[PDB]
Amino acid sequence: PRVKGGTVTRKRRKKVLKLAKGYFGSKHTLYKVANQQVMKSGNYAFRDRRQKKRDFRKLWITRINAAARMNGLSYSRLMHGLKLSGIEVNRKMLADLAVNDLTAFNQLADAAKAQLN
Amino acid sequence: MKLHELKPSEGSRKTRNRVGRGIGSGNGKTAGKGHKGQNARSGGGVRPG
Amino acid sequence: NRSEVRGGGRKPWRQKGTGRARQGSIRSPQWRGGGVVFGPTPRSYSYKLPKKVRRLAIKSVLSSKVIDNNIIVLEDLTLDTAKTKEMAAILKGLSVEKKALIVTADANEAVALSARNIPGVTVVEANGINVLDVVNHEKLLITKAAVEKVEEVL
Amino acid sequence: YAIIKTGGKQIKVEEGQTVYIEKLAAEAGETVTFEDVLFVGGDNVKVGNPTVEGATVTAKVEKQGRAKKITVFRYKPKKNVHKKQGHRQPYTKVTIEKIN
Amino acid sequence: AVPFRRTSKMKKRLRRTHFKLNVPGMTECPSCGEMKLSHRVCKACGSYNGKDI
Amino acid sequence: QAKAVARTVRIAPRKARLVMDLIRGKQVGEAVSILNLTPRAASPIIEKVLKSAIANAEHNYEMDANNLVISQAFVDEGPTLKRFRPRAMGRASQINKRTSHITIVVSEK
Amino acid sequence: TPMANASTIERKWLVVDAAGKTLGRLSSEVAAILRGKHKPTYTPHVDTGDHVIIINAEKIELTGKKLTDKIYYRHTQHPGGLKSRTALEMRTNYPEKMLELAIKGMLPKGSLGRQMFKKLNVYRGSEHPHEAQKPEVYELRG
RNA sequence: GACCGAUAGUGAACCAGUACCGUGAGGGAAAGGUGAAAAGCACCCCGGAAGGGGAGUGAAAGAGAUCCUGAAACCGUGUGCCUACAAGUAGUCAGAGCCCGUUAACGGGUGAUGGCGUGCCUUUUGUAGAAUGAACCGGCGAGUUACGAUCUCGUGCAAGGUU
RNA sequence: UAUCCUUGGGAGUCAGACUGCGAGUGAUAAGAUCCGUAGUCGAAAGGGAAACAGCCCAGACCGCCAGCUAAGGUCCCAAAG
RNA sequence: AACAGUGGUAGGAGAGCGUUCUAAGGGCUGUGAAGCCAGACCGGAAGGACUGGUGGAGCGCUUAGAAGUGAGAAUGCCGGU
C-alpha cells in the first residue's frame, strides 16, 4: 500500500502559523521562516520567565531605597537592620507598602533604625 | 480467542527501528552511521576479514 | 524501479557550467515521473508452523468453543432437498442467529448447496477444519461422525 | 490589610478578597487558616517578631484548578536538539475572611 | 548589479505611494454642461470660449 | 445596491488599480468625466462597466441614477497568458500577458 | 503584582545652584532624579522624574588640570572633521552644553532617555525664567 | 489482489510514442471530473463584442463549459488599534492606553515605552558568520525486499526437534 | 563510598582547540608546532570578564512577581556603600 | 511513601503519537460523511476533540496485523506565484 500524506503536513504547518500571529509579514505568512522564529520565541520565553524574577527584584529594591532615603536611610543599612530585627517580610511587600502605605514603611524603618543603635 | 480481542504474547513482537525519520527518534540525519567515511555510504564498507 | 521505468539513459545536461544541479537521468526518484527507490515487489507472506503447534491450536480453540457453549452436536443431517429454507429453519430451531460453521465427514452436497447462499454460514468436512473459520463463525455444528473423525485423527 | 506567607512566597491581603495561590489539600469548599502571619496592617499595627502571635487569617476555597498552559520550547540552535513540553501549574482559588 | 535581497511588500508599497495619477484640471462646458479640460475644447459641445468650431 | 463586473479582460491589473484609485468613493457623473478626460488605456473599459452598473441599477432596482455613489471598486488579477520572447543567445524570457477582473458596486448616498 | 505608574504623575520643579560644585558628582544626582529614582513610584518605562533647573553653570568647579587638559572631542561625518574644545573654553563660552553633555552621557539611551533629558533646563547665571512653575530648591546629598 | 488512484499507476486513464526537439539514429511530454438528467440560461437591460446584472431551469447557478471540493504562496478592497526624533535577526518578558467580548478562564486584538536578544541547515577546533544551501508556497522525494548466518525475546516440544 | 569483572548484542570515534603547569623545535617569537599533565569547550546553557567557544564563578526537568550566596561589584548609564 | 536524581552532540536502549490498507466486532452519516476555513478547548510531546461555516458522499472507534508510513533544506524534480 501507498501513503500520500496530504493532510498532516498542512495541518501541522497551519498550527504553527496560527501560533505565529502578529509577526511582521512573512514571519506570520510563511511556514518555515515563522517556525524558526516561533522556536526562537520559545527560547526567549524560557529566558524571560527567569528574568522576571531578576527584574522585579530590582524594581522593588529601587522603590525601597528611595523610600528609605527619604526616611533617612540606605537600602543596605535598612535591610541589615530588618534582618537583625526579624522583619524578614520580603521586598515585594515592602515595595507595595512604600507605594501605598508609606506610614507602615516608616514604622518598619524606624524599628530597624532603632535596632541599628 | 476472538478476532476483536486479539493480543500477542508479550516480548514476541517489537516495533522495527525506522531511521531517517527525525531527530526525536535519535536516528535522524545519519541513521546511526555517524558522519562521513567508508562505512557511512551506500554499499559502504569493506569485506569482513 | 529506475531501471524498469522507460527512458532515462542520457545525462540530461552536462555536469558543469550550468547553474543547475547535477542529474544523471530524468527517471531518478527526485523527478516527477521517476523510478521508485525500494517500494514493494511480488513475494509470499506464507510461513508454516510445526504440526504439534498447529494441532494444539485447533484443539485449544475447540476447547474454548465447548467451554463457552457455542458448540452443538447434531447427528444425521438429512435433507430430502438441497434448499436453504430448510436449513434456515433448522438454524432457527437451534437458535442460531449469527455466523455459524457446519461440519460433516463426507461432504453432504445438499448441505453445501444449501447454507452457502446464507452470508454468515459456512460448511466444511472434518478434514477441512481450520482454526480461523472456527474463531470467526462464532458457533459450531457437528455430526458425531465428524466428531469421531477429528478425535481419532487427534 | 494583612500579610501572609503561604507557598514559599508572600501575599498582601484584604478581607473579602479573592486570591490565587499554590496547590493545597482542600476539597473545593473547605476552609483554611493561615497562621504564618505577620504585619496585620490597615489599622493599629502589629509586626511579626518573625511572626505575630496568633492573628490567623481564615479563608475558604472556591476552586482547585490548573492554570493556562505554556509550551516551553527549547532548542540549541545547531546540534539538532529540541524539547517541547507543556505545563499547567496547579493553583488554588481562595476567598478571605477574618484577618486577626 | 542585482538585488542582494528580495524586496518586501512594505517597501514595495512605500515606493508605489507616489506612483499614482492626479486628476485633470477639470471644468464644465458652459454651452452644453458636461465636463472638460481647462483651456481646451469641449469635445461634445464642440465649443470653446463661447465659440463653436 | 448594484454591481457590475468585467471578467477576463486582457489588461494589466495595476494600471486599472491606478485608474479606479482615482475615483473610489465618488459620484457617478464626475467619475465618468474623470474617465472620459484622463488619458489611459483602462478608462474606456472602466466607464463601460460602470455605465453597465448604473444601467443595472436603474433597470433592475430603480435607484435614481443621479443620486448614486461608487460604494466600492476593485480589481482582481485573473488568469494570465504565458508567452516567450526570444532574447539573445537562444535564451527566452517569460512574458506575462496579464488579465484582470474589474468589479464595481454602486449605491445611493 | 505591584503598581506600575501611568499618567498618575506629579512632576515638581527643582532648582540647583552650582557655585562650587563638581559637575560629575552633581550630574550623577540630577540625572537620577530626572529618571525618578528618588521616588517610590518609580517605573523604568514611564519617566517618573522631576523637572530640574540649574543656575550659575559657569561657576562650576573641577579637579586637577582638567580645564587645560580635559578635551571634548566631536566628529562630524566628514574626513578630518574632528574638532576639540577644552573644558575651559566650554565653561566660558557655553557651560550649558557641557553640563548637558555630562548629564546626557549618564542618562539612559533611547526615546525615554531623550524625553527625560527634555525636562532639563540649564541657565547661566541666576536668572531662572521659570518662575511660573513655582519650583523649589534641592540641596545635594553628596 | 491487506496493488495505484491522475506529480501515483503503463511513457501514455483524455486521438501518445502524439505534440515538440533533432540531419539522423534517437529523445519525449503536458492534459481526467458540469449535472441524476441539458433541463445548457427563452426573454429584458448595459455594452461593438467579450463579459456582466436580472429573470428562468435545477436540490443547488456561490454548478454556467478549467463545469465536484478548492488550501497556500501571490494579488487586492474595507476597517478596529498603532505609527512621521527614530536606528536594532524583527521576537520575548514587563506594561499603560484604546477596541472587543470567549470552547468563560487569573479572556481576546492592538500595542506607546523599558529590559534581554547576532536567523535555520550543513560542515567545522570553532560559524551571527564576510564559509555552504534554500526566492516563496504546494506536492513527490532517501536505509527497503528476497535468501542465508548470528544474537536477543517469545512460543511449542524436549535428549529429541524438524520436514 | 558504590562502582568493578566476565560473556554476549549494538555503535560511533582515530581533523581536535584554548588556558595553566613541565619540556622540546623555534629567536626560551607566534592565537605556531609537537609531547606530558589538569581543566573548559567540543557535546554546556546561566552570571562576570563591555562585546567576546576555550578565562573567573557555576551545571538548566517545569513553573512562581519568595529568599541566601559565589565570581564580580555598589556616583549615573546599571541593583546595591 | 521516603530518599536521590533528571544539560547533552556522535551513538546505544526504551516508551509512545500519527498516516494508508486489511480482518473481526461494534458504530456515524442527506436530520448532512470525508475534505477545507475558523475559533479564547484538552493532553507532558508527537498530537487529539468540540462548536460554527463551506462542501454534498462516504468515514471514524476498539483490538491486532502489514507497510511505497511522517520532510525545511540535495545549486533536489514538477507546477504555480
Task: Report DSSP letters for C87-134, one per residue.
Answer: HHHHHHHTT--S-EEEEESS--HHHHHTTSSSSSEEEEEGGG--SHHH
In chain C, the residue whose alpha carbon lies closest to the alpha carbon of B6 is C135
Chain D residues in contact with A38 (beta carbon < 8 A): 73
Buried b (16+ CB within 10 A) or exposed e, F34-49: bbbbbeeebbebbbeb
Taking the CA of residue D42 and the nearest CA in chain A, the distance in Å comes to 9
Contact C64 B1 (CB under 8 A): yes
Question: Which nucleotide is at minimal CA–C1' distance from B19?
Answer: H143
- Tally of CB atoms within 10 A around E45: 17
Question: Which nucleotide is at minimal CA–C1' distance from D11?
Answer: I66
Chain A residues in contact with D70 (beta carbon < 8 A): 45
Specify which residue's alpha carbon is closest to the C1' of nucleotide H135. E6
Rounded-to-integer distance, Cα C84 and Cα D31, Å: 75
Q: What is the resolution of this structure in A?
A: 2.9
φ and ψ of F27, to 5 deg: -65, 150
- Tally of CB atoms within 10 A around G97: 15
Residues E52/E29, Cβ–Cβ less than 8 Å: no
Which run of H or of E encompasses F15?
Answer: helix F13-23
Question: Which nucleotide is at minimal CA–C1' distance from C54?
Answer: H156
Q: Integer distance in angstroms from CA G76 to C1' H102?
A: 57
Question: Residue A81, CB half-sphere, CA atoms under 13 Å: how many?
Answer: 18
Domain boundaries, position C55:
1-154
- How far, rounded to the nearest angstrom, does the alpha carbon of residue F31 sit from its chain's CA centroid? 12
Q: How many domains does chain C have?
A: 1
Task: Write the residue in D49, D71, D74 that is nearest to A86 by C-beta.
Answer: D49
Chain A residues in contact with G108 (beta carbon < 8 A): none
Cell of G93: 563660552
Question: Which nucleotide is at minimal CA–C1' distance from G1?
Answer: I65
Q: Could you tell me which residues come within 8 angstroms of residue F5 by beta carbon, excluding any fewer than 6 positions away?
A: F49, F101, F102, F103, F104
3-state secondary structure of G50: coil
Domain boundaries, position E41:
2-53
- Tally of CB atoms within 10 A around B25: 13
Contact A99 G40 (CB under 8 A): yes
Rounded-to-integer distance, Cα A94 and Cα G2, Å: 10
Q: Integer distance in angstroms from CA B35 to C1' J70?
A: 24
Residues 10-29 of chain B with CB under 8 A from chain D are 23-24, 28-29
* Amino acid making up residue F66: N
Taking the CA of residue E7 and the nearest CA in chain F, the distance in Å comes to 18
Interface test with D, best of A16, A88, A99, A100 (most D CBs within 10 A): A88
Q: Integer distance in angstroms from CA A90 to C1' I62?
A: 25
List chains adjacent to chain G, taking adjacency as at least 3 C-beta pairs closer than 8 Å: A
Q: Does A6 touch chain E (CB under 8 A)?
A: no
Q: Is F18 exposed, middle or buried (0-12, 13-18, 19+ CB in 10 A)?
A: middle
Chain B residues in contact with C135 (beta carbon < 8 A): 1-3
**Alpha-carbon distances of D48 from A91, A115, D14, D41, rounded to whole Å:** 15, 15, 17, 11
- Tally of CB atoms within 10 A around G34: 28
Which residue is listed with cell 530597624?
A112
